[PDB]
Amino acid sequence: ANRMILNETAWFGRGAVGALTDEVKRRGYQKALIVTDKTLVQCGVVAKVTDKMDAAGLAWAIYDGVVPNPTITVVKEGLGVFQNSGADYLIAIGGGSPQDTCKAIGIISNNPEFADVRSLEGLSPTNKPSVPILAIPTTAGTAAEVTIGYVITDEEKRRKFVCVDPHDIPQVAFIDADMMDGMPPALKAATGVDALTHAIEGYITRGAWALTDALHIKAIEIIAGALRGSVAGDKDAGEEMALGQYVAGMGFSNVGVGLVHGMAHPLGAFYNTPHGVANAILLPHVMRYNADFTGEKYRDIARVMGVKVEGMGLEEARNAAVEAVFALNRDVGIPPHLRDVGVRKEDIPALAQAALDDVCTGGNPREATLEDIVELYHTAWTS
Amino acid sequence: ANRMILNETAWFGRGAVGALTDEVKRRGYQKALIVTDKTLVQCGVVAKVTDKMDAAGLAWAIYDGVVPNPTITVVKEGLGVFQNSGADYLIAIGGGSPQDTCKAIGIISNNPEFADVRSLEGLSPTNKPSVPILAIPTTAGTAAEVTIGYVITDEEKRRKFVCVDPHDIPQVAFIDADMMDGMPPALKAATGVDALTHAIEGYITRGAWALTDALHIKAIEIIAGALRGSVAGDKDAGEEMALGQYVAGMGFSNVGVGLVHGMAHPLGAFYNTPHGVANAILLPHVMRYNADFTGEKYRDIARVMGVKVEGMGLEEARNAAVEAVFALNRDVGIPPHLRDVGVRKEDIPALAQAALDDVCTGGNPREATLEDIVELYHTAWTS
Ligand SMILES: Nc1ncnc2c1ncn2[C@@H]1O[C@H](COP(=O)(O)OP(=O)(O)OC[C@H]2O[C@@H](O)[C@H](O)[C@@H]2O)[C@@H](O)[C@H]1O
Ligand SMILES: Nc1ncnc2c1ncn2[C@@H]1O[C@H](COP(=O)(O)OP(=O)(O)OC[C@H]2O[C@@H](O)[C@H](O)[C@@H]2O)[C@@H](O)[C@H]1O
Ligand SMILES: [Fe+3]
Ligand SMILES: [Fe+3]
């Protein structure tokens, strides 16, 4: 049998954060700890929520110590602030980095034996549900509001580790493009191709079945339809992106992804590479590697990305899908090679070993060796 | 902004009830009341769960007093057993009738002021969640396991009333075709077209939006593909129906249905007509009537029901959508006329009034008048 973890309650559309104060009152919670980052505070995005909480008369403290590719130190610091604050619930406001940090804090608080943080890696054997989380994404990106996965950086061991736990599922998700509009075009592109990567990897993942197939092929159609428009400042396309990224979440959380995420994670660990930029550069090269092990599925990807596949042979349709991704990356301004984002040639062996051991690689529909991954890094590295 | 209530946890596929004993142990629950009917006990369907519970040493009691179109009397009786059972959670085993009875019991148990049952009608103003419910459907049919609506028969007022309450959502759903196989062909046919009615009405309902559109159109595709096979005893067909009927639920719960359900409920109240048969006979007639208020959506329906809709204009396509429904009904042995199932012509005015006042009607994409519902009943009634 196949398990699906989803949000019991989610609110969708511009003004969705409007529903937060009523949801909190209904659940009888006392005091929030908002988990977020310096930018989202300074930019006024956090105030969009806190102003409504102030008006509703709902108490909150804040932790904005989160940095991109959040570290063990960031988690431990956040858990301390959560403890000193007297909060009884969590509000995650931001992208994957603040939301993953929130999940770790929420989990360790009710599962104190995991306080070293790195011991959460894998299928965390937690006995207790997280401290309730209310989740408000600010990127059109990670779907952390609906997934059971979170990614923390172990700096001592220079690796990103994936934690997978149904106990970390937020009680309510607020998916509001008014929280997303501040994203610089480059961030919309990076988080948008992260979402496309979730949906493409999820579509072809080893554990894929009919329900996740339906969710993923819909997310690919929405994301591929909307991302250029959203990067160009189109407000309706940003709302479409907000839905597409979430629908990708509903799928990949529950079945897995593949070698793109496997190879992206060590780039974050080694260089602090933005996760979506890493995914974006790797994705077409990994799709090529995986192509002959995906059955009819690249035909579907090509069709909902705007290719006429009607009279195409299967290998022709597979190339069309790969080229459609190279073209999207070009159109939204992601550079074509890993060298362009500062990946060192010397590091490929260590990166390849880290990728081989990443939790995500297990879902890849083609079984990757060390030599395959070394070669993929090289192919993606330069022309 | 649009709200989605879904199951936080759900298990899908043949053998999915195998996940029940672990879900109960992880939630620390001490004793179930199983809410079901005598037919499911008799056929050993209930034993498929209680045998697994016995092996895991999990305590249960049974209430099997549920009848089709469950009554205020049945709810009060089951409630009485729950209170004297010492149970701390519920397992609903059966179609809509047990699952809806189970939700009424679980709501009233934790919201005792609703003991008269009829005070639940509409957006039930409950302050507390239901007693936790684990939902196991045995028809390929109502999606009661994932919806927030339940339907009780008021015998003194001769009407079915809808109770809509986020507090009633089951904690875990187990969607297991093995629990469904024993449906007589006629029951697979009726519940299957109920599922199709949810998906079609959900797709064209007034509250419809992007997420519910994608769920409903996918559910129409799965059900149109699978239903003939499942009725004829095909294993895989039955598993596809089990998924499709659930996917329809994920949508219609959250946005509504229309005049088919509005007109079906009075037939249940007046004659105890099976819900699915009532929906089946009415569906193609009401689609016809709605056609001109559904923009392009009947184009999409005809397509996913296997009609080459390429050359066609909007009215060609609209009519093909309707005939695709007409044909499916015939093939699965559904009476094509209301007079076949003992609907009396004299009652049509009274039925029309009840249908105009049924909440499901409010979601209908075309705003119905009394005389329109009178005419639709007459159309659906004759040979
Ligand atoms: N609406 C916004 N407007 C402006 N800047 C924003 C906005 N939302 C986020 N940012 C900024 O974008 C930068 C990247 O934020 P992240 O949270 O790191 O981005 P995201 O891609 O959503 O999350 C990545 C993280 O999630 C994991 O899945 C992944 O492994 C990685 O750790 C930060 O400086 C953040 O302040
Ligand atoms: N697996 C099965 N095998 C054999 N018989 C079965 C099975 N499942 C159900 N039945 C029998 O089918 C009959 C109809 O069962 P219901 O639960 O009434 O059917 P369903 O269509 O699932 O629910 C209808 C109810 O749901 C509401 O949406 C609607 O208003 C109505 O009250 C009953 O006699 C029941 O015992
Ligand atoms: Fe990702
Ligand atoms: Fe129904």
From Swiss-Prot, chains A, B:
Oxidoreductase is among the record's keywords? yes
Q: State the pathway, as annotated in the record.
A: Carbohydrate degradation; L-fucose degradation
- An example molecular function term from Gene Ontology annotations: metal ion binding
Cofactor dependency: Fe cation
**CDD domains to which the protein is assigned, alphabetical:** LPO
Residues the record lists as binding Fe cation:
D194, H198, H261, H275
Q: Enzyme class, one word? A: oxidoreductase
One Gene Ontology BP term is: fucose catabolic process
Q: Indicate which residues the UniProt annotation says bind NAD(+).
A: 37, 69, 96-97, 138-142, 149, 160, 179-183
Report any Pfam family annotated for this entry.
Fe-ADH
Q: List the Gene3D superfamilies.
A: 3.40.50.1970, Dehydroquinate synthase-like - alpha domain (1.20.1090.10)
Kindly give the InterPro entries that the UniProt entry links to this protein: ADH_Fe/GldA (IPR001670), ADH_Fe_C (IPR056798), ADH_Fe_CS (IPR018211), Alcohol_dehydrogenase_Fe (IPR039697), Lactal_redase (IPR013460)
Recite the UniProt keywords alphabetically: Carbohydrate metabolism, Fucose metabolism, Iron, Metal-binding, NAD, Oxidoreductase
So which domain of life are we looking at? Bacteria
Q: What reaction gets catalysed by this protein?
A: (R)-propane-1,2-diol + NAD(+) = (R)-lactaldehyde + NADH + H(+); (S)-propane-1,2-diol + NAD(+) = (S)-lactaldehyde + NADH + H(+)
Q: What is its EC number?
A: 1.1.1.77
Q: Which SUPFAM superfamilies does its entry note?
A: Dehydroquinate synthase-like (SSF56796)
The entry describes its oligomerization and partners as: Homodimer.
State the family it belongs to: Belongs to the iron-containing alcohol dehydrogenase family.
Q: What is this protein's name?
A: Lactaldehyde reductase
Query: What is the species of this protein?
Result: Escherichia coli O157:H7
Lineage of the species this protein comes from? Bacteria, Pseudomonadati, Pseudomonadota, Gammaproteobacteria, Enterobacterales
Tell me the gene name.
fucO
